[PDB]
Design an enzyme around this catalytic site. Structure first.
Site, PDB file in Angstrom:
ATOM      1  N   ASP A 150       0.411  -1.374  -0.234  1.00  0.00           N
ATOM      2  CA  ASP A 150      -0.063  -0.165  -0.119  1.00  0.00           C
ATOM      3  C   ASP A 150       0.651   1.179   0.044  1.00  0.00           C
ATOM      4  O   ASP A 150       0.394   2.326   0.527  1.00  0.00           O
ATOM      5  CB  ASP A 150      -0.635  -0.624   1.070  1.00  0.00           C
ATOM      6  CG  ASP A 150      -1.958  -0.256   1.026  1.00  0.00           C
ATOM      7  OD1 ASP A 150      -2.162  -1.683   0.569  1.00  0.00           O
ATOM      8  OD2 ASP A 150      -3.652  -0.122   1.347  1.00  0.00           O
ATOM      9  N   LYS A 173       4.104   1.831  -4.588  1.00  0.00           N
ATOM     10  CA  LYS A 173       4.864   1.359  -5.263  1.00  0.00           C
ATOM     11  C   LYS A 173       4.059   0.773  -6.823  1.00  0.00           C
ATOM     12  O   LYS A 173       4.799   1.580  -7.705  1.00  0.00           O
ATOM     13  CB  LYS A 173       4.617  -0.390  -5.039  1.00  0.00           C
ATOM     14  CG  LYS A 173       6.134  -0.742  -5.367  1.00  0.00           C
ATOM     15  CD  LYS A 173       5.778  -2.551  -5.082  1.00  0.00           C
ATOM     16  CE  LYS A 173       6.324  -2.522  -3.400  1.00  0.00           C
ATOM     17  NZ  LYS A 173       4.346  -2.172  -3.075  1.00  0.00           N
ATOM     18  N   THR A 174       2.920   0.863  -7.616  1.00  0.00           N
ATOM     19  CA  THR A 174       2.226   1.073  -8.369  1.00  0.00           C
ATOM     20  C   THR A 174       2.293   2.502  -9.436  1.00  0.00           C
ATOM     21  O   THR A 174       2.664   2.612 -10.220  1.00  0.00           O
ATOM     22  CB  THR A 174       1.259  -0.792  -8.294  1.00  0.00           C
ATOM     23  OG1 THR A 174       1.488  -1.428  -8.003  1.00  0.00           O
ATOM     24  CG2 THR A 174       0.375  -0.750  -9.874  1.00  0.00           C
ATOM     25  N   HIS A 213       3.539  -7.374   0.131  1.00  0.00           N
ATOM     26  CA  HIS A 213       3.822  -8.549   1.120  1.00  0.00           C
ATOM     27  C   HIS A 213       4.278  -9.591   1.121  1.00  0.00           C
ATOM     28  O   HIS A 213       5.679  -9.004   0.843  1.00  0.00           O
ATOM     29  CB  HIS A 213       2.019  -8.974   0.066  1.00  0.00           C
ATOM     30  CG  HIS A 213       1.516  -8.790   0.126  1.00  0.00           C
ATOM     31  ND1 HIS A 213       0.593  -8.177  -1.332  1.00  0.00           N
ATOM     32  CD2 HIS A 213      -0.515  -8.457   0.948  1.00  0.00           C
ATOM     33  CE1 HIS A 213      -0.482  -7.056  -0.964  1.00  0.00           C
ATOM     34  NE2 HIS A 213      -0.894  -7.741   0.296  1.00  0.00           N
TER      35      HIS A 213
END
Ligand code: PAR
Ligand code: GCP
Ligand code: MG
Ligand code: ZN
Lengths: 83, 99, 208, 405
Positions: free
Chosen positions: D21, D24-25, D85
């Site tokens: 969260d 990153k993306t 994760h």
RNA sequence: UGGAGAGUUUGAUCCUGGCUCAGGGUGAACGCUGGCGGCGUGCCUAAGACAUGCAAGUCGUGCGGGCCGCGGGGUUUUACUCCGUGGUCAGCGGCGGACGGGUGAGUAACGCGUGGGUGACCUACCCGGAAGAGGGGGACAACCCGGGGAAACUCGGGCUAAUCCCCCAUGUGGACCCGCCCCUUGGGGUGUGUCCAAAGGGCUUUGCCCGCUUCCGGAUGGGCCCGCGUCCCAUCAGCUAGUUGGUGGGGUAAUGGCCCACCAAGGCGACGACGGGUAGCCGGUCUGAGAGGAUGGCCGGCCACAGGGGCACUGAGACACGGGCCCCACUCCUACGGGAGGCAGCAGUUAGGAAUCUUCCGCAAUGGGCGCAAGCCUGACGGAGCGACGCCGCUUGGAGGAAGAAGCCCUUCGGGGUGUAAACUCCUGAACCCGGGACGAAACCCCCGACGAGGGGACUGACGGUACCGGGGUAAUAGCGCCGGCCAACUCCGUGCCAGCAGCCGCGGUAAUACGGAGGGCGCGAGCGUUACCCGGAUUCACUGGGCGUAAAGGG
RNA sequence: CCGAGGGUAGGGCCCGUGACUGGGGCGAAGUCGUAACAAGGUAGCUGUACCGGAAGGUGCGGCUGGA
RNA sequence: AGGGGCGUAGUUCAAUUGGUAGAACACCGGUCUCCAAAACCGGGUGUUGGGAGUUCGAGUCUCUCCGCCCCUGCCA
């Protein structure tokens, strides 16, 4: 129409055409009307092109239409020569 | 995607449309002819027949009907118009059908 | 390809002193001339009675090994002998004889057929002027088999040739010891070949 | 209708890691839009199609390493976008096993988290020389001097695993906002809009510091496979990042590792982000259409070397160093019957630990000459670099000292 | 110019009889192993679904234009923008897209095969003969203006050319009605009446070349029909209304219930109708002493099919593989009213399966289409690629070299084997290096000569810098099955009705030539084995060439 | 009119499957008895009928392939 | 690649408060025999799927990894 052409034979890398009168629509090496000669484009033997004139003439005198490279051969055996 | 073979298609609809009509005409014109031949109207009969034998035979010049087809229609229009002008007819106007 | 491996061992097994080395095989040691029994841990023990099949298998192997040919060629050759007219028992040997690398051997150009081959294989031989490197090539009558110029000056071509002095080639071959030529005059007859093999049997092995 | 790849500037692979969260993306999709306007040859990607896999999308998170292409009038980049994760670490580790440089990502609001650690730790064991930080989530509560504490402790973390932490270029800003305006501002250069200029501090920050590693195309050839796809009507395509040498259409190549015997083929095509590459070179991130082979023969973890160079081997006696517990490694010892998970390039095939004579034990630190036999024959050379995980924490690192068979 | 048997029922024997073995064949697959070349050959399953590219066009010597760049400026300049002349994009018009290529799903059928029939017929282009090619009238695209549409693209108005259509004339002739003659199913001559022809284009211009029109002959290619032949089940025995025939109509190129009204009651079947199952058929292929048996993959011929189901249009020809229309399933687009597709063409993907290939090179040759020709199109084809799938040729060396290394294996401890095998000495020279270098290609075309015959000249090579040739030059791959009998080839150890072998009979229960390994041996060798399938042996469906008292089998 | 296809209804054949159920073949050393082979200890076998844990027993006729 | 199951002697299976693992039939060993079968004596013969973790001690609780099954992914 009916034509006079070369129908291949022999092996790969060893062309060996057969001079033949045959309906234009027939596939190349298919079934023909009459066989009139053979031509080895690699001339191996003092016998690299036989051609029945009498017959070659019959056909011509009825509609048979030779190929360019089929005329040359026919001619070479003297099909047209009249004097 | 597509091929210049639609030229052959378009080209077709017309020719279709073309002899379609040249064909309808011969049907109608040959009916009227025998309808008047059975009735006895010998004159106005051949008048029409002889005018159909025309439209028919022209179909042959083209690609509509042809040869023996065209000829067939005729041998059934004359062979017909004649077997009608017997009902007390005496082909007065021997226009097309020879005696 | 061509066997390649212990040879006098075959000489042994078959029993009949086979000649697969030419030179030494005339020496006081073809091995056959030294231990005339089959090879292996057993070889010199009570020989059971051979089934008619053994007799035939053995007689064929004998012949075939005498040429250094493979089964494929040997048989394929035999089958052709069958079709051709005349006693195939004969024709067969005639064909096995007409083989090139063999005639090179049958002319002295090489002491042993194994050698004859390599010779043929490496250009060293010449048929009717042109050079052939096909051991299998079938020499036809009236043909000339001969050493190629680039070879004459070779240590080997010399000696084997040096031996043909005063000696005579099989009644069906001609030889010019001076110029390394030699013609295949006639197709050899069963007689002309003094082979320790009963071709009659070889024919039987291939029937059933 | 595919277009030929026009290699102008030099290519460098940069990946993007960091906890969950933390942007990153989006930060990734950002670099796409940002670097877009100021130059063509980029092809825009969004927070949506960057993560096109159902669930990944519908469910929310990032599950597969992306792979984006964006350049600068200075240097051409290939952006490998790893997932946060744990669980998927096997997919970041594979994304990481490539990228020349890693754009680390931490969040002002949260600070360095458990995955932020491990990722960095993996980077120190994967071989990602050079890291760049990017504090995201800054547009949160006026932290006069709080976001400063982040750059104080994040650097502590980097300089905690042999990383130029004190030197590492820690840009600041938000990707969302940066993205957002750009999202509704297709065409538009820098030195204009607020946050958009905060992205460039990072981009440029990458053109500098971060290298462009000693590269060679003179040695054989090698290409660890990252993934394999079946391209309709085309065939089996295998991707990865090239190691040594180069490869062009028509070349022979062998698929080495993780199977009975290696299969040789002929490359049928190469590309780079759907661009018909004429000849991919080392360090290049390619896709290879392998002649007539099936998706049942190529597998992530094997190589695509030149025929005759580097065969597959199971047993290998190799020297190795073992991370101490302080290094977040092992806090005990193993027997000559220990079976860990090594990581050669992009694959991890489990092997045994047949320990030498007189080493009845091995604890933290240390580094002896112990042998090992893998359960899957893998492409091995002389001096190959590998790590040793197990349980959920790296435990060593060494290289082939010798080869058995 | 042609014929071989063996193992196995018993304590033993003869007979009967089945099983099995020895041979040969293959679009193979699977295991172990695998060096080279040539010629062949390679989805047997899903006629499953298929991204992408390409497989059919071509003529300005049929016609008018759109556009780009030159000749003279129509006038003296731009204006009613006219010609000379090669490039370009469609249109119109011709000829070809019906052949070439693919496949075997369907089909038990005059589909095929074979021999005939057509007085019952058709044939574009091509030859040969005869006769013409005279006048007239018009439309529709292209293009311009307007309107609709996201797109695929369609509708209104306005001109326009032709070898486009249409109308009259001539009528060597040809078609049609009735009559005569001859002949004999609708064919040949003949008479009065009626009806039907056509187009110009290029030049080197009262003449050539190319087209055009009608008619006869000829070729080639076909339609239809008939005799005979073409698998299994009779536990399919009765079948049939367009049903069988007639008369008269429609239809066709043409006979015919092919289609329709009307009349009649037939037609078919144990010589196998009806039905069900399976299947493309032949030339040929394999096997066999033969008679037979099995088979239909390469290639050649015929049929049938082109996502599934039907249909007609154009046309010499199709009810049309890369044409059209409708329906269905399915996949795809949308600006939600309508659009798009069909690889059993080439290459290729995926699914299925034990299993079957390159998104290659080139029109250089051969063949085809259009063209005056140049030449354009040609995934036909000529080639190359991949796979020991197959056949054939080739290599891993040759000659010496000890009463005979070592290592390993037997051992009546004396000795024996592997074995000239190795080493070793020479000898040759696969590879690799350097160099030359093809045949396949003479004609289309030009020139002296009539574009005649005949002669001379010129271009063109994908494969290939390959084949083949010369110079120099390195010893430089070997495996697989088997050894109880049949069936070529034996010992030791391990194991102990265990583990395991096994084609048939059988091996293994503590001295196993039968299991596993080792040594040795036999067979074959870039291969060797395994499984599957066909014939043979099998006179074991017996025609050749068998049998039935007790072996199976005489019907009460 | 014909007409691909769609619908409603009723038949025919086929491939697969089904609670339960019948017998069959095959499988070193489990149970009961002992029908046959020597009047096999009741000559055997047979068609049919009835009965019986099982082989089988009995009736009537037949056979000799029993003395 | 991401989810979820399943792995205990030879074969079916029980012990999960965390405590060397039994129950039946097999099986091996011995006696008798040519050898078994029967009979009679005698022996759990296991990689609790592998490797580590926590623990005083793991079948169990952690984790990683191997194989298998199940669902969902996956166009250079
Ligand atoms: N195949 C036998 C057929 O069935 C019957 O025979 C079957 C049974 O009655 C017979 O059983 C025999 C038993 O009679 C005798 N007194 C003892 C023997 N152990 C059994 O044997 C049977 O069972 C054992 C397992 O228990 C198997 O291992 C064996 O192969 C099997 N034949 O074994 C046969 C099954 O194989 C008929 N009587 C016979 O005529 C018929 O052909
Ligand atoms: N306040 C704020 N929120 C942001 C920022 N960038 C991203 N986010 C939030 O995070 C959400 C998704 O973040 P994303 O980039 O996918 O996270 P991630 O780093 O990929 C986490 P993982 O890859 O492990 O799934 C966004 O929709 C948004 O609400 C930012 O700069 N500031
Ligand atoms: Mg993410
Ligand atoms: Zn000897």
């Amino acid at each position: 129409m009916v034509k006079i052409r070369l129908a291949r034979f022999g092996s790969k890398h060893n062309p060996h055409y057969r001079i033949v009168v045959t309906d234009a629509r027939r596939k190349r090496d298919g079934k023909y009307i009459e066989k009139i000669g053979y031509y080895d484009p690699r001339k191996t033997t003092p016998d690299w092109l036989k051609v029945d004139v009498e017959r070659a003439r019959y056909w011509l005198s009825v509609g048979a239409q030779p190929t360019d490279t089929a005329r040359r051969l026919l001619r070479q055996a003297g099909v047209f020569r009249q004097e | 995607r597509n091929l210049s073979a639609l030229k052959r298609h378009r080209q077709s609809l017309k020719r279709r449309l073309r002899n379609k009509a040249k064909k309808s005409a011969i049907k109608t014109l040959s009916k009227k002819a025998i309808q008047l031949a059975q009735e006895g109207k010998a004159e106005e009969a051949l008048k029409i027949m002889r005018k159909a034998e025309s439209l028919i035979d022209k179909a042959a010049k083209g690609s509509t009907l042809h040869k023996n087809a065209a000829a067939r229609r005729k041998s059934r229009l004359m062979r017909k118009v004649r077997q009608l002008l017997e009902a007390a007819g005496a082909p007065l106007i021997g226009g097309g059908l020879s005696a | 390809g061509r066997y390649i491996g212990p040879v006098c061992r075959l000489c042994r097994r078959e029993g009949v002193k086979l000649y697969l080395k030419g030179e030494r095989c005339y020496s006081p040691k073809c091995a056959m001339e030294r231990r005339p029994y089959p090879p292996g841990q057993h070889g010199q023990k009570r020989a059971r009675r051979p089934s008619d099949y053994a007799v035939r298998l053995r007689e064929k192997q004998k012949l075939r090994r005498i040429y250094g040919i493979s089964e494929r060629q040997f048989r394929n050759l035999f089958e052709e002998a069958s079709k051709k007219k005349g006693v195939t028992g004969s024709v067969f040997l005639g064909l096995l004889e007409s083989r090139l690398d063999n005639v090179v051997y049958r002319l002295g150009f090489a002491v042993s057929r194994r050698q004859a081959r390599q010779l043929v294989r490496h250009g060293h031989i010449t048929v009717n002027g042109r050079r052939v490197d096909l051991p299998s090539y079938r020499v036809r009558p009236g043909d000339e088999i001969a050493v190629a110029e680039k070879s004459r000056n070779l240590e080997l071509i010399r000696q084997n040739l040096e031996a043909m002095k005063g000696r005579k080639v099989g009644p069906w071959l001609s030889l010019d010891v001076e110029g390394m030529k030699g013609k295949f005059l006639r197709l050899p007859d069963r007689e002309d070949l003094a082979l320790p093999v009963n071709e009659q049997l070889v024919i039987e092995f291939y029937s059933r | 209708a595919k277009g030929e790849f026009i290699r102008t500037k030099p290519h460098v692979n940069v990946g993007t890691i960091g906890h969950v969260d933390h942007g990153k993306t989006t930060l990734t999709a950002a670099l796409t839009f940002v670097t877009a306007a100021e130059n063509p040859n980029v092809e825009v990607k969004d927070y949506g199609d960057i993560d096109k896999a159902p669930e990944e999308r519908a469910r929310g998170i990032t599950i597969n390493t992306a792979h984006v292409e964006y350049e600068t009038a200075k240097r051409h980049y290939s952006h490998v976008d790893c997932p946060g994760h744990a669980d998927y670490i096997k997919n970041m580790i594979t994304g990481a096993a490539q990228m020349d440089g890693a754009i680390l990502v931490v969040s002002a609001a949260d600070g360095p988290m458990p995955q932020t650690r491990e990722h960095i730790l993996l980077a120190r064991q994967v071989g990602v020389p050079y890291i760049v930080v990017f504090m995201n989530k800054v547009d949160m509560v006026d932290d006069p001097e709080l976001l400063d504490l982040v750059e104080m402790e994040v650097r502590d973390l980097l300089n905690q695993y042999e990383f130029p932490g004190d030197e590492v270029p820690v840009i600041r800003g938000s990707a969302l906002l940066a993205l957002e305006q750009m999202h509704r501002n297709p065409k538009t250069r820098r030195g204009e809009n607020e946050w958009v200029d905060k992205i460039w501090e990072l981009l440029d920050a990458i053109d500098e510091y971060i290298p462009t590693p000693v590269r060679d195309v003179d040695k054989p050839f090698l290409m660890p496979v990252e993934d394999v796809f079946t391209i309709t009507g085309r065939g089996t395509v295998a991707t990865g990042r090239i190691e040594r040498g180069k490869v062009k259409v028509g070349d022979e190549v062998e698929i080495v590792g993780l199977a009975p015997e290696t299969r040789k083929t002929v490359v049928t095509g190469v590309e780079m982000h759907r661009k018909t590459l004429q000849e991919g070179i080392a360090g290049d991130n390619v896709g290879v259409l392998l002649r007539g082979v099936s998706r049942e023969e190529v597998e992530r973890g094997q190589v695509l070397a030149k025929p005759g160079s580097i065969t597959p081997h199971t047993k290998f006696e190799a020297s190795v160093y073992v991370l101490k517990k302080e290094e977040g490694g092992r806090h005990t010892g193993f027997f000559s019957g220990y079976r860990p998970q090594f990581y050669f390039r992009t694959t991890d095939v489990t092997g045994v630990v047949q320990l030498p004579p007189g080493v009845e034990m091995v604890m933290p630190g240390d580094n002896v000459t112990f042998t090992v036999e893998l359960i899957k024959p893998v492409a091995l050379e002389e001096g190959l670099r590998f790590a040793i995980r197990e349980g959920g924490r790296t435990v060593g690192a060494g290289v082939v000292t010798k080869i058995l068979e």
